[PDB]
């Protein structure tokens, strides 16, 4: 009884979330019509974490979908699992997105803000207990980045205690889908630093690199990319849903990995990812998982950990395995590469074990780490935002919405200070 409320914003959030419920529904065994048709009693133990029961054996997820234009939602409902969601949780505008952070924050955000919060209030106060919320959104866009941050402040004010875990996609370095991204990301970071507890950073390029390097997918689509993200969000909350030899829920993870209030941005990775033809040669061992998790190429964020130093690291293991073998690997990987860890914090690797693995795969693992390499990701957007700001670029679109020019100087000043803060703790 640690219920979690799920919020999806924008085209990126809605399509990732739709794939996410396909994963959980299969894992628990819920038929797409919403009825339980499973194979084990362990699945009905703690289904209350994410679902509600409709009278007559039909289960409804705790999902809220947010968008400014209704084009994406009707695309979601036409999906095979579209019928599952509650129809009245679909909250949408009737105006174009604008791809504008200011327009989403001020013009269309205020109108939709009041309606969305009461939909949140229904799911939040319909459960016996509430551990935290769960937000999925992208930072390069205008609806997820703009309206998503506004809801983040409102959630904190009403519900300060709960854990506002968020998953974010960061604009890419090389090829990106929007001209005005440096403005969108820089303004959004100021809201994330002060309000949210945990932020996970995903880069689309690393997802392409992982697909072509390891999985050898000849023609990957956005279904394959969102498939990888769904596993990590599945792994983190698996400690809540199933028994284990050593439990590690969200509040444990935040306490251990976050040493200081502003340093809480994380990288993630998932093992085992196996190629098509390399399958016949790969032997399942606990060290085999350890190699993939700490291999730099497996990180879903295109920031190289070797260029920085680790502050904390955490690993989860799923399945029945030996407890000695898990603990030995964390000790071994820590001592073998001591140059990448901070001295003034010993035992930087946290560990946990869960009993029930993902269906069919007899072991699996998830990694969450915190490192000073994020200075790479923020230096990139700061450089582009600088050249776009030095001369006034597209800015006139944002000023005509109500945004003051002083907000840009406030946004970058906060962003640059967060870069310096990671620099100092490296010493």
């Amino acid at each position: 009884v640690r219920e979690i409320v799920h919020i999806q914003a924008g085209q990126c959030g809605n399509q990732i979330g739709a794939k996410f419920w396909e994963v959980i529904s299969d894992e628990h065994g819920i038929d797409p019509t919403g009825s339980y048709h499973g194979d084990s009693d362990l699945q009905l133990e703690r289904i209350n974490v994410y679902y509600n029961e409709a009278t007559g054996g039909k289960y409804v997820p705790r999902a809220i979908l947010v968008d400014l234009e209704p084009g994406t939602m009707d695309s979601v409902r036409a999906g095979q699992f579209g019928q599952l969601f509650r129809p009245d949780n679909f909250v949408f505008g009737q105006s174009g997105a604008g791809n504008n952070w200011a327009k989403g924050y001020y013009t269309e955000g205020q109108e939709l803000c009041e309606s969305i919060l009461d939909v949140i209030r229904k799911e939040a106060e319909s459960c016996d207990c509430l551990q935290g919320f769960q937000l999925v959104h992208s930072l390069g866009g205008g609806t997820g980045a703009g309206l998503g941050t506004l809801l983040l402040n409102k959630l904190r004010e009403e519900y300060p205690d709960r854990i506002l875990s968020t998953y974010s996609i960061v604009p890419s370095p090389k090829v990106s889908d929007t001209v005005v991204e440096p403005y969108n990301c820089t303004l959004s970071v100021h809201q994330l630093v002060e309000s949210a507890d945990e932020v996970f950073c995903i880069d689309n390029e690393a997802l392409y690199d992982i697909c072509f390097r390891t999985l050898k997918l000849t023609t990957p689509t956005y279904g394959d990319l969102n498939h990888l993200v769904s596993m990590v969000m599945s792994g983190t909350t698996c400690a809540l849903r199933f028994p284990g030899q050593l439990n590690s829920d969200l509040r444990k993870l935040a306490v251990n990995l976050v040493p200081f209030p502003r340093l809480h941005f994380f990288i993630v990775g998932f093992a085992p990812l196996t190629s098509r033809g390399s399958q016949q040669y790969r032997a399942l061992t606990v060290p085999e998982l350890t190699s993939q998790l700490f291999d730099n190429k497996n990180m879903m964020a295109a920031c190289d950990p070797r260029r920085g130093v680790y502050l904390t690291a955490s690993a989860h293991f799923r399945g029945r395995m030996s407890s000695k073998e898990v603990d030995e690997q964390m000790l071994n990987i820590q001592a073998r590469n001591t140059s990448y860890f901070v001295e003034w914090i010993p035992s930087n690797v946290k560990s946990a074990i869960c009993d029930i693995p993902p269906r069919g795969l007899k072991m699996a693992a998830t990694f969450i780490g915190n490192t000073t390499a994020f200075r790479e990701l923020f230096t990139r957007v700061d450089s582009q935002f600088q050249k776009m700001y030095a001369r006034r670029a597209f800015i006139h679109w944002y000023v005509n919405e109500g945004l003051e020019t002083v907000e840009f100087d406030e946004a970058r000043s906060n962003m640059t200070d967060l870069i310096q803060e990671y620099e100092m703790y490296e010493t």
Binding site: V1, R2, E45, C129, Q131, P243, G244, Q245, L246, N247, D249, R251, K252, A254, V255, N256, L257, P259, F260, P261, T312, M321, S322, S323, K324, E325, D327, L331, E343, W344, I345, P346, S347, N348, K350, S351, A352
Partner: protein
């Protein structure tokens, strides 16, 4: 008759506990339903003419560990009241488990333990289990003992806790919880036994022949020690040792109480077929550093009084010759003001083997509890790890936000520092 009460805290305490009661029901001859297909009164109560119930309370602030027992085969044995589960765990945070969430459940549990003490006419003590790194194990464990100290007073409260390992670690905030709970432990506890997972990992791989163990095997080995410790109260023996005797004999001072554990023979089934395993053999194996359940070498320090407990075919003549020989061993040191140095006990009932257990069945076995200055090695490592993090204050904000005042951090830090020279002064001689 004479009664003992067991209390279990946290994931470690609970899943150790069901392993121990699996042994105890098997030993006495009680089916999982509580019926039968004596010494039951020390651990169980009879309801009407047929059914038994453990004198135990299972406590944890999250339901996953407890509900495993509730749906298990043993669910009918326990009273539904004994299984107490909180709403949300302490997240390995001492302040959360002590001040904010711990006080939400403390008074509910204290009634239930007290109510069980009414049924114990001749009660003589309690057993309490902890994991130092856990939030509920350290945070709520401190609150439980502080209340229990004034509730009962002159009753022997023994503890059986898991010391964080020298190198093996699963929690980053692990040093913070151990020191804070240590200050509360030292004044209230009568005596608490040290064990750690890392030494149990090495022993159960080297002596016991297992490539890849889990917590399940380690929980068995803990049960063997506790069973032999309680064997004097239950079954006949040529030299009985009550709980109160351990308190006076082992601890020279108030704060020096912490003993360590050892057990022999630990041997695989097909090697015990190959080896004689007499009284002298098992006594020699106890004193080797490899068999110590705490990964600290006694050769770094000195021995004060030690307690020996034998089970099975042992005869008092062979005991005296064996321990006399170990005095001749010059690789073992004793402080000068403890010339006697030993407390021995002999019991007849052999150890109870388990369906599908790894330990072989020797008809004679020995258990040891020894108090040594070598434990000061472990305190130095724990202190060093705490000192690194507290200098830059890497985790203070979490504890302060959950009701803890910072001024408790240096005070508990000084109390450990006093204990460090408490052990150095005792190590000296005149």
């Amino acid at each position: 008759m004479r009664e003992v009460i067991s209390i279990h805290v946290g994931q470690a305490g609970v899943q150790i506990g069901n392993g121990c009661w699996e042994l105890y029901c098997l030993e006495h001859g009680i089916q999982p339903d509580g019926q039968l297909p004596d010494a039951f009164n020390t651990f169980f109560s009879e309801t009407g003419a047929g059914k038994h119930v453990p004198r135990a309370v299972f406590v944890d602030l999250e339901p996953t560990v407890v509900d495993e027992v509730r749906t298990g085969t043993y669910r009918q044995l326990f009273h539904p009241e004994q299984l107490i589960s909180g709403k949300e765990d302490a997240a390995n945070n001492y302040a959360r488990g002590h001040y904010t969430v711990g006080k939400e459940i403390i008074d509910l549990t204290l009634d239930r333990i007290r109510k069980l003490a009414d049924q114990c006419t001749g009660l003589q003590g309690f057993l309490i289990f902890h994991s130092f790194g856990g939030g509920t194990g350290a945070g709520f464990g401190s609150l439980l003992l502080e209340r229990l100290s004034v509730d009962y007073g002159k009753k022997s409260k023994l503890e059986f806790t898991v010391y964080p390992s020298p190198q093996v670690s699963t929690a980053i905030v692990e040093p913070y919880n151990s020191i804070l709970a240590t200050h509360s432990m030292i004044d209230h506890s009568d005596c608490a036994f040290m064990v750690d997972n890392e030494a149990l990992y090495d022993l159960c791989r080297r002596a016991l022949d297992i490539e890849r163990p889990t917590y399940t095997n380690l929980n068995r080995l803990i049960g063997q020690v506790v069973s032999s410790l309680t064997a004097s109260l239950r079954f006949d023996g040529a030299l009985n040792v009550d709980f109160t005797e351990f308190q006076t004999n082992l601890v020279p001072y108030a704060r020096i109480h912490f003993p360590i554990c050892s057990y022999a023979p630990v041997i695989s089934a097909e090697k015990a077929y190959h080896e004689q395993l007499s009284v002298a053999e098992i006594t020699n194996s106890l004193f080797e550093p490899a068999n110590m359940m705490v990964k600290c070498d006694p050769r770094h320090g000195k021995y004060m009084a030690c307690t020996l407990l034998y089970r099975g075919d042992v005869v008092p003549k062979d005991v005296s010759a064996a321990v006399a020989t170990i005095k001749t061993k010059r690789t073992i040191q004793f402080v000068d003001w403890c010339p006697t140095g030993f407390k021995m006990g002999i019991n007849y009932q052999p150890p109870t083997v388990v369906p599908g257990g790894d330990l072989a069945k020797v008809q004679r076995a020995v258990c040891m509890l020894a108090n040594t200055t070598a434990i000061a090695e472990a305190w130095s490592r724990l202190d060093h790890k705490f000192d690194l993090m507290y200098a830059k204050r890497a985790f203070v904000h979490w504890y302060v936000g959950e009701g803890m005042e910072e001024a408790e951090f240096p005070e508990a830090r000084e109390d450990l520092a006093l204990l460090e020279k408490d052990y150095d002064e005792v190590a000296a001689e005149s």
